[PDB]
Amino acid sequence: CFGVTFKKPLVAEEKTSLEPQLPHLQLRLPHLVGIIAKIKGIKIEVTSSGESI
């Protein structure tokens, strides 16, 4: 209109959510509980010698 140009109003997103990126250390000692559980049940068997004889 005349010399000036008119532009439409811009709609705005109401909310934003922040989810930052985190470094991944990738440690291996955690989630190894099964090995500890296996260590718990060694179960060495010893039979008395001389009771039979």
Next chain:
Amino acid sequence: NNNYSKLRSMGYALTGAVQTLAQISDINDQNLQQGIYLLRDHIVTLMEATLH
């Protein structure tokens, strides 16, 4: 009831005891060694990860 016979019979019994005792001793020693080896293997496996 011969004097040699009731001695031969005791000679029979006086060797199976030694044989069985040797067998049981070997079984116990092997079981102990296997247990120690399993324990050391698991310990090494657990030990590497914490160092890393």
